[PDB]
């Protein structure tokens, strides 16, 4: 079999993969990125295609340009179950042509030196002497099995985790997710008969009956084109998602013409804290494969780019120390946790609370303004539910006569700050990962119990 040697092998060319390749380019390294999909189809996984503007600024990534930007976004409208209360949150963002932008990022990284092979699949992890040292690839372009060696493998295979799942089960980097720590989501993109009111605003509909554990959304991709879909918490016993979709479509999008459908289909999306470690001997995991999705609103394309940034940073460190062990790549964790991980950990706890609320809990909480329209912005910008804000909210649900889960919002706010306290104190060395993880597990075990 043919053999090749590279410094870095990036498996998967999604938002996470292309972010790693872009950031690692022009640094004196020999890089190979692969993706099973053909070039023109790379990055077309079922998505809402809605990404925050703040993400692009931070990392110094290319702004959506021209055809890549389908519709400019200025904010979000959060509708209550009975729809008697509409929260308008001002937050700038983009509704983009996801495959078109993704391929541009790849096209540029290719110009900056990175090599990209489409129609190529990582089939077997090369794992010898206790290290990930590359992979066996199948290039369907030339029907050839090639063996690629690398000092560091970047796992960016998405929610499938098709590569790292084939690693031995004692590696912390093969951590699996529980069914209930993920949501199945489905979406379609159709044209509307009439225009779209406030088309520069995203619409999110909370409703535990029409989308239990998640929500419905109405994302305008233009003047007369809309990305409508929903998400539901998995591992609960809920019926097929396309049954929820078919039953309640007209309720959230009656203006669409069902004959002008462009794309459909759905996929899995994780709604939890990131992998306890995203780095191990000779391997870094990023994107959906490392559970980098926001547990509350389910956005994952912004925080995927962050994981890719932190991956380049960690790898450049490892090569400067010739150390590709977990310890040598460990800065991947310290970086991502400070950037988005600690925020996720706190929101993981908050998600567990929000998913358990009745429609009456949300109808009451929103109508009575249990929190500001700007404090919901802060609670998911920094992932913090301030002890002073919970107190202002707790004295509003005091005027509630019926029993509710709302009365535990204070204890939830304390548990959120507690687990974020832990993630700020992330292990300095891999020697502490085990001890620190079980403590995190204890925090979640206790909190899960406190909701009952």
Ligand X SMILES: CC(C)=CCC/C(C)=C/CC/C(C)=C/CC/C(C)=C/COP(=O)(O)OP(=O)(O)O
Binding residues for FAD: 15-16, 35-36, 45-50, 122, 288, 300-301
Over the window 11 to 50, marking each residue x when it contacts ligand FDA by CB under 6 A and - when it does not, the resulting string is: xxxxxxx----------------xxxx----xx-xxxxxx
Query: 374-412 burial string, b = 16+ CB within 10 Å, else e?
Result: ebbbebbeebbbeeebbeebbebbeebeeebbbebbeeb
Of 354, 370, 389, 409, the one binding ligand X (CB under 6 A) is 354
What is the spatial distance between Cα 156 and Cα 139, in angstroms, rounded to a whole number? Answer: 18
Site membership for ligand X, residue 61 (CB under 6 A): no
What mask, x for binding ligand FDA by CB under 6 A, covers residues 118 to 157? Answer: ---xx---------------------------------xx
Position 217 contacts ligand X (CB under 6 A): yes
Burial track 156-177 (b if 16+ CB lie within 10 A, e otherwise): bbbbebbbbeebeeebbbbbeb
- In 3D space, the residue among 407, 416, 405, 402 whose CA is nearest the CA of residue 447 turns out to be 416
**Beta strands 182-192 and 225-233, pairing class:** antiparallel
Token duo for residue 236: 């609960």
- How far is Cα 224 from Cα 226, in angstroms, rounded to an integer? 7
Answer for which of 103, 271, 277, 363 binds ligand X (CB under 6 A) is 271
Comparison of 43 and 302: residue with beta carbon closer to ligand X: 302
Tokens describing residue 142: 């030339």
Binding residue for ligand X, selected from 72, 77, 91, 166, defined by CB under 6 A: 91
What distance in Å separates the CA atoms of residue 20 and residue 138, rounded to the nearest whole number? 22
DSSP secondary-structure letter at 153? E
The stretch among 243-251, 264-272, 365-373, 381-389 that binds ligand FDA (CB under 6 A) is 264-272
Q: Tell me the torsion sign for CA atoms 150, 153, 154, 156.
A: positive
Binding residues: 15-16, 35-36, 45-50, 55, 122, 288, 297, 300-301, 340
Return the one option of ligand X, ligand FDA, none that residue 351 interacts with (CB less than 5 to 8 A, by type). Answer: ligand X
Instruction: With beta carbons less than 8 A apart as the criterion, state whether 153 and 166 touch.
Output: no
For position 297 contacting ligand X by CB under 6 A, the verdict is yes
Q: Does 351 bind ligand X (CB under 6 A)?
A: yes
- Give the C-alpha distances (Å, rounded to integers) separating 316 from 16, 153, 262: 17, 13, 42
User: What, of ligand X, ligand FDA, none, does residue 158 touch, CB below 5 to 8 Å by kind?
Assistant: ligand FDA
Contact between 294 and ligand X by CB under 6 A: the answer reads yes
- Residue 59's SS3 state is helix
Residue 162 binds which entry of ligand X, ligand FDA, none, CB below 5-8 Å type-dependent: ligand FDA
Binding mask 155-184 for ligand FDA (x = CB under 6 A): -xxx-x-xx---------------------
Stretch that binds ligand X, among 151-159, 173-181, 192-200, 293-301 (CB under 6 A): 293-301
Site string for ligand X, 306-345 (x = CB under 6 A): ----------------------------------------
Shortest spacing between CB 6 and ligand X, in angstroms: 31
DSSP 73-99: EEEEEEE-TTS--EEEEEEEEEEE-HH
User: Which parts of 178-197 interact with ligand X (CB under 6 A)?
Assistant: 183, 185
Provide the minimum distance between the beta carbon of 194 and ligand X in the complex, in angstroms, as a whole number.
23
- How do beta strands 50-52 and 215-220 pair? unpaired
Chain position carrying tokens 């013409």: 257
Residue 118 exposure: Cα atoms within 13 Å on the Cβ side: 12
288 token code pair: 């959906």
Which residues of this protein are in contact with ligand FDA, per CB under 6 A? Answer: 11-17, 34-37, 42-43, 45-51, 121-122, 156-158, 160, 162-163, 185, 187, 229, 266-267, 269, 287-288, 293, 299-302, 304
Which residues of this protein are in contact with ligand X, per CB under 6 A? Answer: 48, 50-52, 54-55, 73, 76, 78, 89, 91, 93, 183, 185, 204, 206, 213-215, 217, 231, 269, 271, 294, 296-299, 302-303, 351, 354-355, 376-377, 380-381
């Amino acid at each position: 079999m043919k053999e090749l040697k590279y410094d870095v092998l990036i498996i998967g060319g999604g938002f996470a993969g292309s972010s790693a390749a872009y950031q690692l380019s022009r640094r004196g390294l020999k890089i190979l990125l692969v993706d099973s999909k053909p070039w023109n189809r790379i990055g077309d996984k079922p998505c809402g295609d809605a990404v925050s503007k703040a993400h692009f600024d931070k990392l110094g990534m290319p702004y959506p340009k021209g055809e890549e930007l389908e519709n400019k976004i200025n904010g979000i409208k959060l509708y209550s179950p009975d729809m008697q209360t509409v929260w308008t949150v001002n937050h700038e963002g983009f509704e983009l042509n996801a495959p078109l932008y993704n391929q541009r990022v790849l096209k540029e990284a290719q110009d900056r030196g990175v090599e990209i092979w489409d129609l190529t699949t990582a089939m077997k992890p090369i794992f010898e002497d206790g290290y990930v040292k590359g992979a066996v690839l199948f290039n369907r372009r030339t029907n050839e099995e090639l063996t690629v060696y690398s000092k560091v493998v970047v796992e960016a295979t998405g929610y499938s985790r098709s590569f790292r799942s084939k690693l031995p089960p004692e590696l912390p980097i093969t951590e699996d997710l529980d069914d209930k720590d993920a949501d199945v989501a489905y979406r379609e993109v159709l044209l509307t008969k009439e225009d779209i009111e406030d088309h520069d605003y995203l619409r999110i509909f909370i409703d535990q009956e029409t989308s239990p554990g998640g929500y419905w959304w109405y994302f305008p991709k233009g003047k007369n084109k809309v990305n409508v879909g929903l998400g539901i918490q998995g591992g609960m016993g809920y019926p097929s998602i396309h049954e929820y979709y078919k039953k309640y479509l007209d309720k959230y999008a009656p203006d669409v013409d069902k004959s002008k459908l462009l794309v459909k289909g759905g996929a899995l999306v994780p709604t939890r804290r990131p992998l306890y470690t995203m780095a191990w001997n000779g391997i870094i995991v990023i994107g959906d494969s490392g559970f980098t999705v926001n547990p509350v609103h389910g956005g994952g394309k912004g925080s995927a780019m962050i994981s890719g940034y932190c991956a380049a940073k960690a790898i450049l460190s490892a090569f400067e120390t010739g150390d590709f062990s977990a310890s040598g790549l460990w800065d991947m964790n310290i970086c991502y946790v400070n950037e988005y991980g600690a925020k996720q950990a706190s929101l993981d706890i908050f998600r567990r609370f929000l998913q358990k609320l009745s429609n009456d809990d949300i109808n009451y909480g929103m109508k009575k303004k249990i929190i500001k329209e700007e404090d919901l912005l802060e609670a998911s910008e920094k992932g913090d539910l301030h002890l002073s804000v919970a107190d202002k909210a707790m004295r509003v649900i005091s005027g509630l006569g019926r029993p509710s889960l709302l009365f535990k919002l204070k204890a939830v706010a304390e548990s959120m700050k507690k687990i974020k306290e832990l993630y700020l104190n992330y292990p300095r060395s891999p020697s502490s990962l085990g001890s620190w993880r079980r403590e995190v597990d204890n925090v979640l075990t206790e909190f899960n119990k406190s909701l009952s």
